[PDB]
Design a protein around this ligand. Structure first.
Ligand SMILES: Nc1nc2c(ncn2[C@@H]2O[C@H](COP(=O)(O)OP(=O)(O)OP(=O)(O)O)[C@@H](O)[C@H]2O)c(=O)[nH]1
Ligand SMILES: Nc1ncnc2c1ncn2[C@@H]1O[C@H](COP(=O)(O)OP(=O)(O)CP(=O)(O)O)[C@@H](O)[C@H]1O
Ligand SMILES: Nc1nc2c(ncn2[C@@H]2O[C@H](COP(=O)(O)OP(=O)(O)O)[C@@H](O)[C@H]2O)c(=O)[nH]1
Ligand SMILES: COC(=O)Nc1nc2cc(C(=O)c3cccs3)ccc2[nH]1
Ligand SMILES: [Mg+2]
Ligand SMILES: [Mg+2]
Ligand SMILES: [Mg+2]
Lengths: 439, 54, 344, 423
């Protein structure tokens, strides 16, 4: 058994992390006070769920997690929330003044003053691991903390844990649910600085989650609470392989081996089905073929883009619930003959499949209906480059006039860092184009 | 349509289907960047204080 | 009020559509780079499809289908027809064709020669035409065809030349049929009821493939090199009413029975084949597009597809009706205000 | 804890400031004695932003009242909520400033400024985490204009990393006390260009027109003008004072509204402008973007919006709010710059202001504000070309060169706006 440490940075990271750990506790039968009656090895064990939870002599199962934010209001809700007893104070780190949506403030001005405290709290968790695999890092692109402090932390983690893997869950900015305007700057700046330190990053576009919540959950105006419950279901689908017995994606290294042949192109597209409204009286349960086919509908993707006009490098299918291999193969064969699924020439046209028999857990009194089977597809397609193109174009519009740049220079950042970061993104867009397009 | 590497446990199973075969900065360098930005903040503040002193 | 942007100034069709949109008092034209548009009349090349459908609260529509180039490039069309089971290499309405990359650059050289030799030994007519996306060479010798492509730099297609075309009388002259087809956001396929024959004004001469004026029917070639330009019909353009009346008087048949049934069949086959790859049914933005299909007719009244043009112009006397039709079926169907097509 | 320190200077500044505290005291359920008597814990959640807690659940405004003559602050201390302010926070002299920027900034004000900073320091030292400062004043007088901008400069020297926002009443010949108002305002504007992060430009002419043309008041008083400012200030500070979708401090709010450091002068607006028929969301949205609801007497159709924020208050449909904002932007598509994507943002707060079921407050960063500075510059030059009324200023030690420089500075500001209006 090898442990994983989760790090939640900024408002988006903290609130998503709070939703995930609630869901983890429900999936593993862990009560809010930390007790887990089904764990017969009191104060110990190296079961699969122990990769995410340590144990005290009193039988409390403690998340291997650190929450970091530069102002206290969001983390204070963890301290006083339903699962307050789960965490101890050392895991919850708060500053006094936030980064004001300013990457330079989160990375240079405030980051410099808190980075050593955050590493010491992480070191404490690492000293409790017999074989640390690495880290899972949750954050927004658009926040000053989520962007600026995350990239500083990732740099130092590469230094202090050179051999350890680092995965990201990154919230990509959507104007529909944001009151900021400088987020394209923060996104390009943090991606540039983090690219070489992240082994595999799962981007979630708030626009996609927002529209899934309106379209499939019949929520007229989704809130962050609605969005985070859905995101936490997808995150759980992705991390379940680390927390349960199995043979696919059993350690962090396997994510890169299975999903990222090209180190810079390490942004897999996530697709999830089915998303069903709990308010619905009764829903006819979808079959393996139907939920699998739904994995190739843009309407169910975590990032809106058209995989028909890109190429695949890898595809993983992660099923939960009443699913057997025979029905997966039957569904795949059918979809190959009806869908546009082009792989790159230097990769096998195939699917790695993982099935966990436990159906998705839902938060009681939530928006998601209980289903008998669900699936999350992780595919590394060049089509996700559309999301970089959108972001880079917004960056270019503002930077040509140097709009808002003075806020960053005022915190000690140099203008050259903007153009350096934008040129890295331009090279990234070219890498995607070389991999996925024919002349 | 070949199924390979089929593994089965009580919690589930996993396998692979093949439809067709194919054809860092150091601690010192980070500190320098952080201290260089802090020094630019100091210089810009010193210029402001000079302006206000005039 | 609805909003739209214009990004292809060289489009005669959508310059007129733009005109009609304003004259409704309910459409406003924005600057070409304004992202808060309802309708984009996009550029021909490198249209930024990846930036469409991400403006909150706006329904966005574009006048091109992403991926339709597969049908509207000469080498792409050959590959699509050969590799698509719906169409297959036994496709009866598409002339035998082969993709040939210049040697200074997969390729089907040896497959073309294999069929070329089979025709020569069998006494069968062995005239082929090389073309790409001037730039045309009609020859009965494979050596002159492969040497012409090597001097170029882009991919070319060698295609069996229709040696026995239907010839209009008087004149003994060749022609081709242009059909305009509109595909809306629901992937309804609308065939404009009015087509045009681009006629040659020089008598067809099967003994001289060197003078490419009675063999090439392009309007530009006739206007510059043909000394009989405009002799029989204005601008070498014959329309369906006259052509139908000719088929009745000369061949005792109708345009619908002898030709249009095959045209409708071919249009439907091509567009249904590519539908899963380009449909915007469940996309965050929606597409429509106007297509120009070019057809040849042989002396047995068999119709052959020659090419599909993804950015076609229209006949001068047909701009008014067709462009209004685009507004009615393609635009106002998505943005309603306050038939000239045949639905296939 | 995101404390804000409030300062009000001079006659206009103290009269508008007093109304501001009456309005928000009512919203937070604080009575004239500083005791809470609300019905909702929402009223106390962010009470600390503007109030200090004393013994016995007493809430004292974090407010500093400044003037160079005692008259207006005697009126405040006798006003409705006059007893709510900390007596130690009244700082005043006796000589007055004679509507003279030089007296406020260089002579009379210089003698009093140190005692004001002493109070400011005491209020700041007891802040857990100071957000920044807000100042209410006019630009056409002597104390608010001259001593107010002197205060801002000394606060920036002592607290250079803190946000400084001002609600600044711009003079108009149609609602004027003295002919030297353009001199005082031109001298002050340059100080604000350098030393504030946001300046809400409140034109007394716009306030007058609204009272006369829209509210149907044949003879508006300064009180009627100040009711509009009070209501606008309540809406502008709503997201700081009540829980909602926004959790931004002053710095984050300014980051997303100010793309260039000198172009931080905002056109504020409010709807409904003072009836028992509650407004529909479409009506709120149309009126708040209407020039007639603006308070800077600048036509937005004459320039371009760099950024816009609008906050809606009351129980209403978020979906319909979103729908209506989309409708307003297409009608004004030509009046938003295209190189700041998504530059129109909205927020909702469930708690409506007193006497209204719903309302909306508008904050526009528009290049049309250059019309306001052009007006002032013209009136300045009409007198300065003849050196008229200058002896009032040279008599306090100023020389003509400082007027020449202030004139050049504001013509540069106007030019900078015109540059981005054509970008
Ligand atoms: N999905 C989701 N997105 C969020 C959530 N909270 C904030 N965001 C998004 O994150 C971006 C704003 O960044 P934040 O995470 O709030 O900022 P931060 O990391 O706390 O950094 P600061 O600027 O210091 O506050 C916007 O795009 C928001 O839409 C959340 O709970 N869920
Ligand atoms: N296989 C074939 N057999 C007989 N004639 C042919 C032929 N291919 C082309 N032609 C003749 O050559 C002419 C031009 O061919 P092609 O269609 O490639 O040119 P083009 O791409 O310019 C048409 P457009 O201008 O509509 O795009 C046609 O009008 C047709 O008469
Ligand atoms: N809106 C408003 N404007 C005022 C008020 N009192 C004065 N003014 C304006 O403020 C300017 C005069 O400045 P004032 O505040 O009286 O002088 P000060 O005491 O030296 O700061 C003139 O432009 C007046 O029109 C007021 O109560 N409300
Ligand atoms: C004391 O100074 C302020 O209150 N400044 C201020 N309040 C603001 C409120 C907003 C605001 O309500 C919204 C921001 C985004 C959507 S509404 C914006 C900028 C602001 N600046
Ligand atoms: Mg934050
Ligand atoms: Mg062509
Ligand atoms: Mg006065």
């Amino acid at each position: 058994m090898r442990e994983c440490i989760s790090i939640h940075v900024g408002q988006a990271g903290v609130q998503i992390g709070n939703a995930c750990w609630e869901l983890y506790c429900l999936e593993h039968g862990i009560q809010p006070d930390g007790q887990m009656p089904s764990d017969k090895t009191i104060g110990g064990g190296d079961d699969s769920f122990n990769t995410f939870f340590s144990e005290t002599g009193a039988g409390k199962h403690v998340p291997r997690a650190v929450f970091v934010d530069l102002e206290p209001t969001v983390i204070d809700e963890v301290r006083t929330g339903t699962y307050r007893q789960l965490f101890h104070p050392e895991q919850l780190i708060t500053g006094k003044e936030d980064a004001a949506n300013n990457y330079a403030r989160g990375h240079y001005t405030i980051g410099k003053e808190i980075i050593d405290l955050v590493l010491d709290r992480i070191r404490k968790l690492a000293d409790q691991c017999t074989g640390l695999q690495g880290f899972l890092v949750f954050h927004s692109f658009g926040g000053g903390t989520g962007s600026g402090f995350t990239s500083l932390l990732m740099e130092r983690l590469s230094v202090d844990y050179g051999k350890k893997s680092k995965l990201e869950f990154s919230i990509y900015p959507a104007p529909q649910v944001s009151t900021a305007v400088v987020e394209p700057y923060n996104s390009i700046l943090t991606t540039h600085t983090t690219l070489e330190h992240s082994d595999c990053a799962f981007m979630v576009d708030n626009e996609a989650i927002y529209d899934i919540c309106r379209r499939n959950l019949d929520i007229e105006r989704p809130t962050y609470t609605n969005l985070n419950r859905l995101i936490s279901q997808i995150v759980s689908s992705i991390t379940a392989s680390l927390r349960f017995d199995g043979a696919l994606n059993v350690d962090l290294t396997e994510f890169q081996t299975n999903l990222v042949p090209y180190p810079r192109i390490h942004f897999p597209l996530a697709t999830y089905a089915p998303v069903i409204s709990a308010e619905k009286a009764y829903h006819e349960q979808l079959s393996v073929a139907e939920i699998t086919n739904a994995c190739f509908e843009p309407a169910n993707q975590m990032v809106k883009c058209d995989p028909r006009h890109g190429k695949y490098m890898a595809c993983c299918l992660l099923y939960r619930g009443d699913v057997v291999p025979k029905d997966v193969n039957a569904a795949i064969a059918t979809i190959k003959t009806k869908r546009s699924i082009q792989f790159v020439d230097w990769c096998p046209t195939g699917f790695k499949v993982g099935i966990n028999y436990q159906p998705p857990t839902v938060v009681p009194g939530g928006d998601l209906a209980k289903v008998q089977r669900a699936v999350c597809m992780l595919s590394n397609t060049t089509a996700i480059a559309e999301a970089w193109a959108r972001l880079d174009h917004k960056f270019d519009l503002m930077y040509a006039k140097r709009a808002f740049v003075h806020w960053y220079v005022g915190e000690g950042m140099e203008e050259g860092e903007f153009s350096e970061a934008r040129e890295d993104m331009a090279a990234l867009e070219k890498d995607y184009e070389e991999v996925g397009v024919d002349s | 349509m070949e199924v390979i590497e089929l593994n089965k446990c009580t919690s589930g199973q996993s396998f692979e289907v093949i439809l067709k075969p194919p054809s860092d900065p150091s601690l010192e360098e980070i500190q320098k960047k952080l201290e260089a930005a802090e020094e630019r903040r100091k210089y810009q503040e010193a210029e402001l204080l000079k302006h206000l002193a005039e | 009020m609805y909003t739209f942007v214009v990004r292809d100034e060289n489009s005669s069709v959508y310059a007129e559509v733009s005109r009609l949109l304003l004259a409704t008092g309910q459409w406003k034209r924005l600057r070409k780079d304004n992202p808060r548009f309802n309708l984009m009349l996009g550029e021909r090349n490198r249209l930024p499809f990846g930036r469409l459908g991400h403006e909150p609260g706006l329904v966005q529509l574009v006048n091109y289908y992403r991926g339709a180039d597969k049908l509207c490039r000469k080498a792409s069309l050959v590959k699509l027809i050969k590799t698509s089971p719906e169409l297959s290499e036994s496709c009866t309405w598409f002339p035998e064709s082969y993709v040939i990359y210049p040697t200074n650059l997969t390729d089907e050289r040896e497959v073309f020669l294999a069929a070329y030799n089979r025709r020569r030994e069998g006494r069968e007519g062995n005239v082929w035409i090389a073309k790409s996306s001037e730039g045309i060479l009609i020859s009965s010798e494979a050596s002159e065809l492969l040497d012409f492509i090597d001097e170029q730099g882009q991919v070319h297609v060698i295609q069996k030349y229709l040696e026995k075309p239907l010839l209009l009388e008087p004149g003994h002259r060749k022609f081709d049929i242009r059909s305009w087809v509109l595909v809306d956001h629901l992937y309804n396929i609308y065939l404009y009821r009015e087509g045009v024959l681009r006629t040659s004004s020089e008598p067809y001469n099967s003994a001289n493939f060197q003078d490419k004026t009675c063999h090439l029917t392009n309007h530009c070639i006739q206007k510059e090199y043909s000394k009989n330009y405009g002799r029989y019909e204005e601008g070498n353009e014959m329309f369906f009413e006259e052509f139908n009346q000719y088929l009745m008087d000369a061949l005792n048949t109708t345009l619908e029975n002898s030709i249009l049934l095959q045209i409708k069949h071919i249009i439907r086959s091509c567009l249904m084949c590519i539908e899963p790859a380009i449909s915007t049914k469940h996309l965050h933005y929606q597409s429509f597009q106007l297509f120009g299909f070019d057809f040849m007719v042989d002396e047995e009244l068999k119709v052959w597809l020659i090419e599909v043009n993804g950015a076609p112009a229209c006949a001068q006397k047909l701009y008014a009706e067709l462009c209004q039709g685009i507004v009615d079926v393609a635009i106002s169907s998505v943005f309603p205000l306050a038939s000239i097509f045949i639905k296939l | 804890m995101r404390e804000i320190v409030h300062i009000q200077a001079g006659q206009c500044g103290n009269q508008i400031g007093a109304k501001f505290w009456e309005v928000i005291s009512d919203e937070h359920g604080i009575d004239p004695t500083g005791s809470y008597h609300g019905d909702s814990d929402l009223q106390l959640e962010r009470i600390n932003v503007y109030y200090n807690e004393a013994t016995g659940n007493k809430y004292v405004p974090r407010a500093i009242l400044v003037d160079l003559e005692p008259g207006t602050m005697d009126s405040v201390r006798s006003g409705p909520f006059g007893q709510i302010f900390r007596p130690d926070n009244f700082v005043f002299g006796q000589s007055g400033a004679g509507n003279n920027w030089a007296k406020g900034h260089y002579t009379e004000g210089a003698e009093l400024v140190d005692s004001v900073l002493d109070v400011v320091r005491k209020e700041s030292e007891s802040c857990d985490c100071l957000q920044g400062f807000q100042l209410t004043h006019s630009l056409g007088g002597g104390t608010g204009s001259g001593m107010g901008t002197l205060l801002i400069s000394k606060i920036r020297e002592e607290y250079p990393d803190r946000i400084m926002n001002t609600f600044s009443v711009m003079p108009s010949p149609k609602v004027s006390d003295t002919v030297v108002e353009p001199y005082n305002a031109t001298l002050s504007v340059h100080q604000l260009v350098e030393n504030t992060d946001e300046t809400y430009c409140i034109d007394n002419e716009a306030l007058y027109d609204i009272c006369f043309r829209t509210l149907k008041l044949t003879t508006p008083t300064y009180g009627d003008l100040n009711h509009l400012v009070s209501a606008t200030m309540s809406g502008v500070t709503t997201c700081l004072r009540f829980p909602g979708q926004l959790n931004a401090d002053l710095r984050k709010l300014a980051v997303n509204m100010v793309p260039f450091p000198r172009l931080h002068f905002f056109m504020p607006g409010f709807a409904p402008l003072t009836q028992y028929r509650a407004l529909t969301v479409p009506e709120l949205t149309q009126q708040m973007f209407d020039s007639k609801n603006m308070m800077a007497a600048c036509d937005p159709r004459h320039g371009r919006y760099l950024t816009v924020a609008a906050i809606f208050r009351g129980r209403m449909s978020m979906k319909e709010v979103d729908e209506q904002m989309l409708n307003v932007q297409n009608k004004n598509s030509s009046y938003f710059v295209e190189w700041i994507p998504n530059n129109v943002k909205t927020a909702v707060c469930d708690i409506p202001p007193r006497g209204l079921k719903m309302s909306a407050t508008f904050i526009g960063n528009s290049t049309a504000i250059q019309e306001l500075f052009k007006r002032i510059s013209e009136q300045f030059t009409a007198m300065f070309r003849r050196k008229a009324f200058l002896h009032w200023y040279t008599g306090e030690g100023m020389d003509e060169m400082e007027f020449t420089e202030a004139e050049s500075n504001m013509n540069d500001l106007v030019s900078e706006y015109q540059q981005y209006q054509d970008a």
